Structure formats: structure tokens, C-alpha cells
Amino acid sequence: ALNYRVIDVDNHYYEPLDSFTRHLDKKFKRRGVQMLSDGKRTWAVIGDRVNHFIPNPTFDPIIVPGCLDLLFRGEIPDGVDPASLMKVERLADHPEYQNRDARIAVMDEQDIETAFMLPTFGCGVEEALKHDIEATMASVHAFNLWLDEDWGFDRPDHRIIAAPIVSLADPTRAVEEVDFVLARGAKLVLVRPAPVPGLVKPRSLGDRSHDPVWARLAEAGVPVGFHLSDSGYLHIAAAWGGAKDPLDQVLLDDRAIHDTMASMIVHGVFTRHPKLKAVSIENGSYFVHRLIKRLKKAANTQPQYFPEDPVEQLRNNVWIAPYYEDDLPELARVIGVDKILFGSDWPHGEGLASPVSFTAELKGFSESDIRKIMRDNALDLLGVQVGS
Amino acid sequence: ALNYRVIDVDNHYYEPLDSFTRHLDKKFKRRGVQMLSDGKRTWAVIGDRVNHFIPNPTFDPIIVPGCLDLLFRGEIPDGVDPASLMKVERLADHPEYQNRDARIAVMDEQDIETAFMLPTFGCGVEEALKHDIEATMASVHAFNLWLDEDWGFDRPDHRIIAAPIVSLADPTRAVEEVDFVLARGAKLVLVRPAPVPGLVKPRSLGDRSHDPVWARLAEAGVPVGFHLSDSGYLHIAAAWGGKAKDPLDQVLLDDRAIHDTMASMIVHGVFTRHPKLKAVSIENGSYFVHRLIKRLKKAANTQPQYFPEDPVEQLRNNVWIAPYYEDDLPELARVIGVDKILFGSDWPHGEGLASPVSFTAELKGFSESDIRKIMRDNALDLLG
Ligand SMILES: [Cl-]
Ligand SMILES: [Cl-]
Ligand SMILES: [Cl-]
Ligand SMILES: [Cl-]
Ligand SMILES: [Mg+2]
């Protein structure tokens, strides 16, 4: 057991059915999220289209944390049926998934001082609304109001950093959203790792029209977080002719986070906003080495576009929560041990059952480097030092 | 200098303006390729849309072989300006780019025994025709006729293996194109590393309707080659608001097409059903291999039911790779086996080696006999 509490940068709640409706402008009652029932099952119907990002939006019954961990690692014994790995429980047996007081008490048992609390259902909504910019902005605001109500962006006990969503789909309205969440004390905001929807056409994350948003975050010392989402990448499997076809995930994997970080870096977001901090959550860290190779090639062939070294921008401005099976010594060699974050993804089935068991993956590190990975790097990410 | 002649699996001709029209029936005169001119420049106009795969389809002036080496490796020296690199000569001064006799004499000077001769313009046509299945199949047939005429799939001197194109867009017609080229002695065919266009929707390379084509190639011992092409991957840049080049575009494209092509072949069981089928990757690099292996292993662990064989072993057994000059070649041999590494110069392209045999400069970490595998013998195994 560690001698200090940890800071877990990847935790989830399970949204109640009204997370996107409780505070939604009635103008968007059909344009946004609706929960409709066939009598047995509830379906999320988003802009009049049934959405399938979450198989059961009631979240009951609910997967056992970590039951898919050995699977996602490949550690699964021979002849064993993967369907047999999934175990579920009654949602009411786990109030800590939806209730802040219950969650804090579980955090105490888990030895977590501060958890970043991130959406589950909410990570699929923006792709569903990508053709309705006004419904996107209203729905993100409704969600953020719900989030601050049930979880709180950062209540005075400083146990939970609940990250609201910022959509850049309407960049003027986005500056209003950022001002609103910053005024309510947000310490981390999530932007989807995907092309930004547009009225006319989609935009790069580094579009100059987004500069006012990045400037607000950078001046506030609040990082942008990029968490695994529906980023619309099934379009690749679609181009290839695409109950799970095994090809789809091979074609998808970690391409969204790679392309997101490329968009940010190549289009000069960190050049224009050198104080801006970013963090990748639940996207793995395998993307880094290909991204570094490709950035080096781009900077060499078009040096005029790279007044600064894009690899150093990656190393300076970006923190990464790796997957448990990633080569962590190698990652530290590449991005620096100070940029590696512990995140458990609790209570998801693909996450760790016991968050602090992440330390089993750190036997290659000194006691003081483990303290950085398990606690202090996250505090560095959130903070801005007076000396910087 | 080596004491054997080499086998170069990546060489090009430059198509004359009529490669896709000489033997094309008039019914496809507008649906296929036309060369239309504005008084100064000539443009490839494909299915009534101006195409931009090749900057100048007359190929005159013509790039100096190897002058873009530094650029394609991102080894442009400190201080050197990128656009100062391109040098051009006149096409008339290099008949070996379009004339078989002149090319043989140049191969003698280069110490190449056999060259795989591959398209330049031809690698962009299929994407342009992906919405017209009949025009695709007819245009590929017309081109294959032109190829056998000017270069010959495999003339008696056995100096040149000129690979015809096979499109799977109409699978029945594809089987018939395979028979056509095989009967004329083809020893390698090119399939585009890209989704296969369909009347109704695109298909995986491993779609079951493609089995008769793979079966015929596997039984004949003729490999399928996948050469760098317009595979339509600019759609990813497009999704990001893309499409002076925007430097993001190429970061988002890179080697994704060959990765996804090999994934489609292996995951959908082409090598499971056709274990004798040989494939070769040409001008796509070899960096894709490590991520592909990672992802194939994950897929096999997650859905073992779909993977009765080890997909990484299928990669290693059935696939040959001509890597980029600058790739880590000892590492590649550690991963796929030295027997699967092929020398290819990409001559005379600008991004290729000016001197094909200089490829050996990157092989100092290998034994004399392994260099012989890479520069000659592995290609003989691939062909059979
Ligand atoms: Cl700044
Ligand atoms: Cl492409
Ligand atoms: Cl077979
Ligand atoms: Cl290279
Ligand atoms: Mg082997």
C-alpha cells in the first residue's frame, strides 16, 4: 500500500436519464436528447434518431468494474468464451455511481484524494448532434448544469474534479460556455477528440476561430482534456464496407487521439497558446510514437509551418494517461516521466477493479517517480506554478 | 559492387497519354480517361471530372530520379530550402522511361536482371472511377492491353515483369480479367490497396464474393501486389476540414491505406481461405507492420472465434514487404523475417534511388547471404 493518497485522472459516473434534459431549453426538447420507451427498454433518441452509443441508457443492470480488464489485456485464458467474462450487478447496489456522497466514501476506501469525474453517456452525444449546431450547444450547456448540480465542477472539499464539456461547434457560444464553467470553478474541461462540427463544414481543432476559447483556458490555467468518445471514426470501417465485425476496431483503434493531437499541434494551437495544457484520457499512449515520427517529417518538409519544434510542444504541453499494458519505461523515455498520469477508469468494466493496483505496472520506476505518476503529475497538470 | 545481378521489385514507366484510351472502347470515351487541354496544359479528365493525381500527364519536363530523396525521408538538411530540391530533365532524353528496348539497355548498366515495371499515372485512375463500375473494369482492361503492347507482361528475355491491374469492383469481370492476364503470361498483378468499389456499397478485400479471384491467383502461384496509390484516404483530412499543401493532410494520411488493406485481407480471412496466396507491399514503407501486428493480436485475443489461425503468423507467412530505404531494416527482419524483405528502388521516380543498387548501403547490418536474399532471392521466392 502507498504512503500517500492518489489522484486518479480517469473516473466515471453513470448519468441519470435526465442528464441532457433536466436543464434543457424546451426549444430543443426534440432536437436534443429524449429517452423513449418501447415498454421494456429505454432508448436514447437524439435529434429524432435512435442512438446506440450506450447499449442501455438506464445503466441497470450495470457491468462489474474490471471484469473486462484481463480481456482487454489479452490475459484471457485459453478456450474461454469472452461473453462469459461480462458480469453485471444491480445499479441500486452501487449508489456511488450516481451519488456524490456515496462516491466520496468509496474514494476513502480506495485511497483516492481527488478523482477526475468524467461522463459515460455524454461522450456519445456530440457525434449524434453534429448536424445540429444549436442543439449541440444547448445540450452541452444543459449537461454542464446537470453536472454541476449532481457532482459539482469542484466543490470546496476538493475531492472531485467534474469536467464539463465544451463544444467548439459555435465558437462564440463556446466562449460563453467556457466563461460560465470557469466562473463555476471548473478546473478541467473536456473537448471531444474529433473534428469540430460546423454550420458550413467541419473544422480543425486548430482553426483560428477557436483561438478565443483556447486563450480563455490558457489564461485561466485550466487544461483541455480529450477523453475517448464517439469521434465519428466508424466512417473508416464504413469506407471498407462495414455481432461485432472484428475489422472495425482494427481500423479504428487509437486514430482519433492521434489525429486530434495532430490537429492541435500542426495547426499551431500550442504555438499561439503556449501556456495551454492538454491531457489525453483513456486513449492509450501508443499513439505518441507514430505522432512523433509524422510530426518530425512534416516539420522537415514544410519548415515554414513549424516556427517551433512540434515534438517539444507535445512533450511540454501534453500529459498522457496510458493504458495499463503500455510500455511505461519506454513512454517515460519518450515524453518524460512527468507527463505520465495514473488513471484507473473506475468503475468501467474495461477499467481497473482496484484503482491503486495501477502500481503493479510501475515496478520499473523509483519510489519518487511512482509518486509523480500516482499523484504529483496530476497536480502539476491542474496547477500553474508562480515561477512559470 | 555485387557479384550477382539484382531483382528490383519497384520500377516505373511513365504512361503515354493514350495508355487508358488506346484500347478503350468509345462507349467509355467520356466515362473513362480523356486528355483535355487548355492551350498550355493537358489535364486528365476522368468520368468528366478533372483529376489531379499527376501534376502533368505529358510527363515533360520530367523529374530527375532521386532528387526528392531528402524530401521524402524528411532529411532535408539544416538551411536547405525544400523547393530547391526538384530538378527536371526532358522526356525525350530518356526513352527508357517509355521504350522497352531502351529500358533493357539501362537495366544492363544498372545491373538489374529483372525489374517489376509498375504504373505511375495508372495508380490514380481507380479512385477517380470508383463511382462507375463498368467504366472501371473497361478502363483497367484497356490499360492492361496497352501494357502488354508497350512493355509485355513477361516477354521471353524475362528481364521485365510488367504487372497488369486487376480491379475487384465487378467480381465476375475480375475473374475474367485475371484469366486474361494469366493466359498472357503475367507473373504478378496489382490490386489497389483501398476499399473495393461496389454497385451497392464498397467491399472489404476479403469479401466472400472475391474468393474466385484469390483462388485463381493462389493456384497459379501469381502474387497480388499492393502499390502506393490514390486510395481515397484524403477523406480523413476532409473530415478534419481539409482537402501550398496543408501540412496536416499528410500527417493524417501517411501509411494508413496499406495498414488497412492488410488488415482487411488478414482479418476477413483471405489467407485462411487461400493459404497459398502470396501478397507483396510495394512503396508503402514497412512502418505499418508493428501497429498492424499489435492490432491483429488484440483482435485475436478479443474475438478468438474469428481467428482460427494466428493472424500475425499469416502476415509473416504470406506477405512480402519492400520497405523504404530509410526504415530500420534489421528491426523489420526481427519482426517479419529477413526472407520477407524485398529490395525495390522506385526508379526513376524523384522519391526513389538514383542508383538502384545503392540500396545495399542500408544493409551493412546484414550478412552477405542475407543481402543476397534481400537484393535477389526473396523476390524469386515471391514469384515462385
Ligand atoms: Cl498562452
Ligand atoms: Cl490515398
Ligand atoms: Cl490456396
Ligand atoms: Cl525513407
Ligand atoms: Mg517467417
Coordinates of C-alpha atoms in Angstrom, one line a residue, chain A residues 71-76 80-82 192-196 201-205 233 235-236 238-247 249-256 258-260 262-263 266-267 286 289-291 293-298 300-306 326, chain B residues 70-77 80 82 193-196 201-205 233 235-236 238-248 250-257 259-261 263-264 267-268 287 290-292 294-296 298-299 301-307 327:
Chain A
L71 CA -9.8 -9.5 -21.7
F72 CA -8.7 -6.0 -23.0
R73 CA -5.2 -7.0 -21.9
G74 CA -5.3 -10.4 -23.8
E75 CA -4.6 -12.1 -20.5
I76 CA -7.7 -14.2 -21.0
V80 CA -12.6 -19.3 -22.5
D81 CA -15.7 -17.5 -24.1
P82 CA -15.3 -13.7 -23.9
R192 CA -14.2 16.0 -27.9
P193 CA -11.2 14.4 -29.7
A194 CA -12.9 14.8 -33.1
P195 CA -13.4 17.2 -35.9
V196 CA -15.3 20.3 -34.7
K201 CA -18.2 22.3 -42.9
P202 CA -16.2 20.7 -40.1
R203 CA -13.2 22.4 -38.6
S204 CA -9.7 21.5 -37.3
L205 CA -9.3 21.9 -33.5
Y233 CA -14.3 7.2 -36.7
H235 CA -16.6 6.2 -41.0
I236 CA -13.3 4.4 -41.8
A238 CA -17.7 2.3 -43.4
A239 CA -15.5 3.1 -46.3
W240 CA -14.3 -0.6 -46.1
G241 CA -17.9 -1.9 -46.4
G242 CA -18.6 -2.2 -42.7
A243 CA -22.3 -9.2 -33.7
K244 CA -19.0 -7.1 -33.9
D245 CA -17.1 -7.2 -37.2
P246 CA -13.5 -7.7 -36.0
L247 CA -12.1 -5.4 -38.7
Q249 CA -11.8 -1.9 -34.3
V250 CA -8.5 -2.7 -36.1
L251 CA -9.4 0.2 -38.4
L252 CA -10.3 2.5 -35.6
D253 CA -8.1 1.8 -32.5
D254 CA -6.5 5.0 -31.4
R255 CA -6.8 7.0 -34.5
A256 CA -9.0 9.7 -33.0
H258 CA -3.6 10.7 -32.8
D259 CA -5.5 12.9 -35.3
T260 CA -6.7 15.2 -32.5
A262 CA -2.0 16.3 -34.8
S263 CA -4.7 18.9 -35.4
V266 CA 0.2 21.1 -36.6
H267 CA -2.3 23.9 -36.7
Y286 CA 0.7 4.0 -28.2
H289 CA 5.5 7.3 -31.2
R290 CA 3.7 7.5 -34.6
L291 CA 2.7 11.0 -34.0
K293 CA 7.6 10.3 -36.4
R294 CA 5.0 12.1 -38.5
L295 CA 5.4 15.5 -36.8
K296 CA 9.2 15.3 -37.4
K297 CA 8.6 14.6 -41.1
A298 CA 6.0 17.3 -41.5
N300 CA 11.2 18.9 -42.0
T301 CA 9.4 19.1 -45.3
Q302 CA 7.4 22.2 -44.5
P303 CA 9.6 24.1 -42.0
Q304 CA 7.7 27.3 -42.8
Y305 CA 4.7 25.9 -41.0
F306 CA 6.7 24.9 -37.9
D326 CA 1.6 0.1 -22.3
Chain B
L70 CA 15.9 14.1 -48.9
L71 CA 12.3 15.4 -49.0
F72 CA 10.5 12.0 -48.8
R73 CA 12.8 11.0 -45.9
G74 CA 12.3 14.3 -44.2
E75 CA 16.1 14.5 -44.1
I76 CA 16.2 18.0 -45.8
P77 CA 19.5 19.4 -44.4
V80 CA 18.4 23.9 -47.4
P82 CA 12.6 22.4 -49.8
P193 CA -4.7 -1.0 -51.6
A194 CA -8.2 0.5 -51.0
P195 CA -11.8 -0.4 -50.4
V196 CA -13.2 -2.3 -53.4
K201 CA -21.6 -0.1 -51.5
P202 CA -17.8 -0.7 -51.1
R203 CA -16.4 -4.0 -50.1
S204 CA -13.6 -5.4 -47.9
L205 CA -10.8 -7.0 -49.9
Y233 CA -7.5 8.5 -47.9
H235 CA -11.2 11.7 -46.9
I236 CA -9.7 11.7 -43.4
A238 CA -11.6 16.1 -45.3
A239 CA -13.3 15.1 -42.1
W240 CA -10.9 17.5 -40.3
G241 CA -12.0 20.3 -42.6
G242 CA -9.1 19.8 -45.0
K243 CA -8.8 18.9 -48.7
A244 CA 0.9 25.2 -50.6
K245 CA -0.4 21.9 -49.1
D246 CA -1.9 21.9 -45.6
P247 CA 0.8 20.1 -43.6
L248 CA -1.9 18.3 -41.5
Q250 CA -0.2 14.2 -44.9
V251 CA 0.1 13.6 -41.1
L252 CA -3.5 12.2 -41.2
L253 CA -2.8 10.1 -44.3
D254 CA 0.8 8.6 -44.2
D255 CA 0.7 4.8 -44.4
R256 CA -2.9 4.2 -43.4
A257 CA -4.0 2.7 -46.7
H259 CA -2.2 -0.9 -42.9
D260 CA -6.0 -1.1 -43.6
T261 CA -5.6 -3.1 -46.8
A263 CA -6.0 -5.7 -42.1
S264 CA -8.9 -6.3 -44.5
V267 CA -8.9 -10.2 -40.6
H268 CA -11.5 -11.2 -43.2
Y287 CA 6.4 1.1 -40.5
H290 CA 4.3 -3.1 -36.0
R291 CA 1.0 -1.3 -35.4
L292 CA -0.8 -3.9 -37.5
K294 CA -0.3 -5.0 -32.3
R295 CA -3.9 -4.6 -33.5
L296 CA -4.2 -8.1 -35.1
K298 CA -5.7 -7.5 -29.8
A299 CA -8.4 -8.5 -32.3
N301 CA -7.5 -12.0 -28.2
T302 CA -10.8 -10.3 -28.1
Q303 CA -12.7 -12.4 -30.6
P304 CA -10.9 -15.7 -30.8
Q305 CA -13.8 -17.2 -32.7
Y306 CA -13.0 -15.1 -35.7
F307 CA -9.3 -16.1 -35.7
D327 CA 13.4 2.2 -42.4

